[PDB]
Amino acid sequence: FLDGIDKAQEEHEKYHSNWRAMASDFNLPPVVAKEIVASCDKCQLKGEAMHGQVDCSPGIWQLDCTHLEGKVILVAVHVASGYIEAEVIPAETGQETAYFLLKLAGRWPVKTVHTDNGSNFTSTTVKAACWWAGIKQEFGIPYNPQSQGVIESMNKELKKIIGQVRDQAEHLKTAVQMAVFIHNFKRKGGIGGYSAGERIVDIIATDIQTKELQKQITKIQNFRVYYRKGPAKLLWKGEGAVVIQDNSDIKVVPRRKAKII
């Protein structure tokens, strides 16, 4: 292929032909043509085809403003449940945002808030509010709304319901509260056939109850598993398996080659 490699490179600096073109024309193994393309800086123009996944921890909220009929609507969503909070604010200011976030934190457990990099969420007043209530702030990558896919999807859902009930109310703020009500309690679906209100209550109660249950379980139950190794702490056992926490690492081991002390 020594002859063809030099020619395909010259043709690539003119044409930037993809690897199949070089492999067909200059009789090349697919790996060599691919290497020619790969080392071209002008031919690197496409990302990888995948999507990430947002954090859906029980304490994470996603926030964003949305605009409707010239007014600013500050919308928050609890990621795990789909529950929502929303108000019309007078302006997209850091002060209005600090106030909204303080109200949210005083009504619901809020461990982390995830927003874009708009001026209102990045402001020092919002920081001071988040420091006071103990809220971690996660800032999305700039110009990447998929980072806040949940609240963007929920802003669509809320705009649709506001459109549905707009002529039942004079002012926009009231339509926003009617739509919030409707979404939280008058729309069922999702993981447990729930409405979002039912679902957030279940998520938060489940968090509380499982925390308590397993804390008591670990207080009373005390063992040490040796597998394969060191004194691994026991997490669970059953059906020919054991769960252990060895140096902050959780691994599923079969019952064989595993002895409990």
Partner 1 sequence: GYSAGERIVDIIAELQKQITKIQNFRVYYRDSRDPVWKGPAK
Partner DNA sequence: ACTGCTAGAGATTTTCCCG
Partner DNA sequence: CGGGAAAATCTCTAGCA
Binding positions for partner 1, 238-257, rule CB under 8 A: 239
CA distance 30 to 1: 12
Binding positions for its own copies, 90-109, rule CB under 8 A: 99, 102-103, 105-109
* Residue 96 binds to DNA (criterion: CB under 7 A): no
Binding positions for its own copies, 211-250, rule CB under 8 A: 215-216, 218-219, 226-228, 230-231, 239-241
Contact 252, 246 (CB under 8 A): no
Known binding residues are 12, 16, 40, 43, 64, 116, 152
* Residue 149 binds to DNA (criterion: CB under 7 A): yes
Contact 55, 77 (CB under 8 A): no
On the CB side of 205, how many CA atoms lie within 13 Å of its CA? Answer: 6
Known binding residues for Mg(2+) are 64, 116, 152
SS3 state at 253 = strand
CA distance 105 to 109: 6
Phi, psi of 35 (to 5 degrees): -65, -35
CA distance 65 to 121: 10
Binding positions for its own copies, 156-215, rule CB under 8 A: 168, 173-174, 177-178, 180-181, 184-185, 191-194, 197-198, 201-202, 204-205, 208, 215
Q: How many CB atoms lie within 10 A of CB 161?
A: 20
Q: Which residues would be at the binding site for DNA (CB under 7 A)?
A: 18, 29-31, 37, 43-44, 46-56, 64, 66-67, 79, 82, 114, 138-141, 144-147, 149-150, 152-157, 159, 183, 187, 189-190, 196, 228, 235-236, 238-241, 243, 250, 252, 254-257, 259-261
